[model samples]
Target: GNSWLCVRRGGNCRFGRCQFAERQIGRCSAFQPCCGR
Candidate 1:
């Protein structure tokens, strides 16, 4: 639905180029969490 910079795992994810990272089958877009190596 949206994107720019994204990440998520245990906390912090609402998209503002918060520029995310980590794992546990992560997932995000405008809400931050795009796990890709």
Candidate 2:
């Protein structure tokens, strides 16, 4: 799991507003098949 924060333009929020993005474990087995490549 990991988390990220960033600011994106076009939103009514301030320029330095904090936003959260996260990734959860889903399909780790899918990456195993690519290791041979």
Candidate 3:
């Protein structure tokens, strides 16, 4: 249910890698993701 939200819409999910404009949104289980505008 948590990962579903990230994979949808503006949420960009990445494992240990995020862009300069993006910030850590949270964890998807064992790894985390970066989300940005």
Candidate 4:
């Protein structure tokens, strides 16, 4: 799951794929419903 800070800081989407600094985690299934299981 993406960090709350990321979501708060201009994260328009809550997908599983989240990029922080230079690291990426999780997999965003779709652009419309991208979220971790």
Candidate 5:
């Protein structure tokens, strides 16, 4: 999936933890995945 699409939309992905109260949507990388609310 185009994980970068997540962060590209002003989101954050800190591995197993996200920057906000979001859920896993896509993955940009294996170590740093993206999240969506």
Candidate 6:
């Protein structure tokens, strides 16, 4: 839990370990694999 590949305009995501998308409430992570990871 060192880093978080947060989606665009999102929060940190060391693998959804944190938050994501500060702009939109939408989850542009997982499923959409290979994001800001």
Which residue runs does candidate 4 get wrong by more than 4 Å? 12-37
Please report the candidate that would top lDDT against the real structure. 5
Q: Model 5: residues >4 Å from true position, as ranges?
A: 17-21
C-alpha lDDT of all candidate models, in order: 0.39, 0.21, 0.62, 0.38, 0.70, 0.35
* TM-score ranking, high to low: 5, 3, 4, 1, 6, 2
Best TM-score goes to which candidate?
5
RMSD of every candidate to native, in Å, equals: 7.5, 16.0, 2.4, 7.5, 2.5, 8.4
In Å, residue 34's CA in model 1 sits off its true spot by 6.8
As a TM-score, model 1 comes out at: 0.20
Q: Output the lDDT of residue 33, model 4.
A: 24
Give lDDT: candidate 1, residue 1.
26
- lDDT by residue (1-37, candidate 5, tens digit) is 5666877886666676666567767776778777776
Q: 5 or 6, which is superior by lDDT?
A: 5
Per-residue alpha-carbon lDDT of model 6 for 1-37, expressed as tens digits?
1123334334433434333542323344553332332
Structural similarity to truth (TM-score) of each candidate: 0.20, 0.13, 0.48, 0.23, 0.50, 0.18
Pairs of colliding residues, candidate 6 = 3-14, 4-13, 4-14, 5-13, 10-21, 10-22, 11-20, 11-21
Q: What TM-score does candidate 5 reach? A: 0.50
Ranking by lDDT: 5, 3, 1, 4, 6, 2
lDDT of 4 at 1: 38
Selected candidate, larger TM-score, 2 vs 6: 6
